[PDB]
Amino acid sequence: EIVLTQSPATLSVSPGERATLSCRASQNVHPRYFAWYQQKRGQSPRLLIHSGSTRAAGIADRFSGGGSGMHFTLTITRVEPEDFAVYFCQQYGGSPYTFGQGTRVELRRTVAAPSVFIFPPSDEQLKSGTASVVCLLNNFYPREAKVQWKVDNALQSGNSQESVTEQDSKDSTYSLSSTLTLSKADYEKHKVYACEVTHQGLSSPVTKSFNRGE
């Protein structure tokens, strides 16, 4: 099977700027047997380029495709606001035909530090054997962010889940949640519960915490 690796995973670009996506193949692919697609949020994929360099139906001439062997590219000459989406490369020079992992072209705004909040488990939940602590990271950019849980200073691992919103349509920011799930008995044996956030808009890692009971 031919593996397609796209880069970067995320291309942060401003409107009017040039954008050059890259796709790398594990094996040689014929130049005239390659395709690109666009994928907006909640929509179906749409063919941009086929047969290597040929634009599809109703595709703006700002889009262009090229490449050969193991290196293929997609170029947007000047990105318009309706060009922000995920882009997939696809080979069909060899079966089984394969796609890339995708490249999200995002709107690059100014850096904005996250607002951080922490929520202790409800007593209602604690009355049912489990305890969930949630850390909220509100409105930030870029989306790269490290969240670290600590329980009595001992930093946690293997027991948390993160979720992140799609990039906001009004201020281009992201929001992220992190959920620490403990058994009640484990939650009872500790006092300090902390969420340490590392982000580019922060000169130093921000910590929001609480003592159990207080």
Binding site: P45, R46, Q90, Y92, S115, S122, N138, S163, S177, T179
Partner: protein, 227 residues
């Protein structure tokens, strides 16, 4: 005018079967090759299966070979996808897609009107196929009790299947609301949370309720989030 309508999704048990259907209209169905492309949870595209204009040449993906069968009915403009021995990893959105209306042989000769499944110019809205062994479960709705502003929310925990819908103050509150994508847990149940930032001074006056609805389990919850 050109449309591709899928039909045949839903919840399948591990080991079970499912037949997808795609009705083409607005074009010469007879001339085109067809294919199916799936999109897994938070993932990209995977080429599943493809057949050419007369259904004579048909290939499949590595992970689905031997389990899936593709077919078409040109006299009735349908293309089908039989899916046997389904597994949880098969959980994805399946798209019916129209291939080319031509093809090229090993000699470099291009045959007009004899379409195949190289790339796809038309895509349907896709259909969701969920493959799980989980029984239906309603969520447990928990309060997430509260610079210059304050944040509160609700924890919608342990439910199956998707989806749930969350609103604040019966819909009267929208600004500041962030309802996060659900996360699949190790137990096969889903959990999510919805939060909203409000002025920290309104906490003592304005009351905040989250409206959670999970149709498959007949579950509606209205939780009042207080300090």
């Amino acid at each position: 005018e050109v449309q591709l309508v899928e039909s045949g999704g839903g919840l399948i048990r591990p080991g079970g079967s499912l037949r997808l259907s795609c009705k083409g209209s607005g074009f010469i169905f007879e001339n085109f090759g067809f294919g199916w492309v799936r999109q897994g949870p938070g993932k990209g595209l995977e080429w599943v299966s493809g057949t050419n204009w007369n259904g004579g040449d048909s290939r499949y993906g590595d992970s689905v070979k031997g389990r899936f069968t593709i077919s078409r009915d040109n006299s009735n403009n349908f293309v089908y996808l039989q899916m046997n021995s389904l597994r949880p990893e098969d959980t994805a959105i399946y798209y019916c897609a129209r291939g080319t209306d031509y093809t090229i042989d090993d000699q470099g000769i291009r045959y007009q009107g004899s379409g195949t499944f190289w790339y796809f110019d038309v895509w349907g809205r896709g259909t969701l196929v969920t493959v799980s062994s989980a029984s239906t479960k309603g969520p447990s709705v928990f309060p997430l009790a509260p610079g210059g502003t304050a944040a509160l929310g609700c924890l919608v925990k342990d439910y199956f299947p998707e989806p749930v819908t969350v609103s604040w103050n019966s819909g009267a509150l929208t600004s500041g609301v962030h309802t996060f994508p659900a996360v699949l847990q190790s137990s096969g149940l889903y959990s999510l949370s919805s939060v909203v930032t409000v002025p920290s001074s309104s906490l003592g006056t304005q009351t905040y309720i989250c409206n959670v609805n999970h149709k498959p389990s007949n579950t509606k919850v209205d939780k009042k989030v207080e300090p």
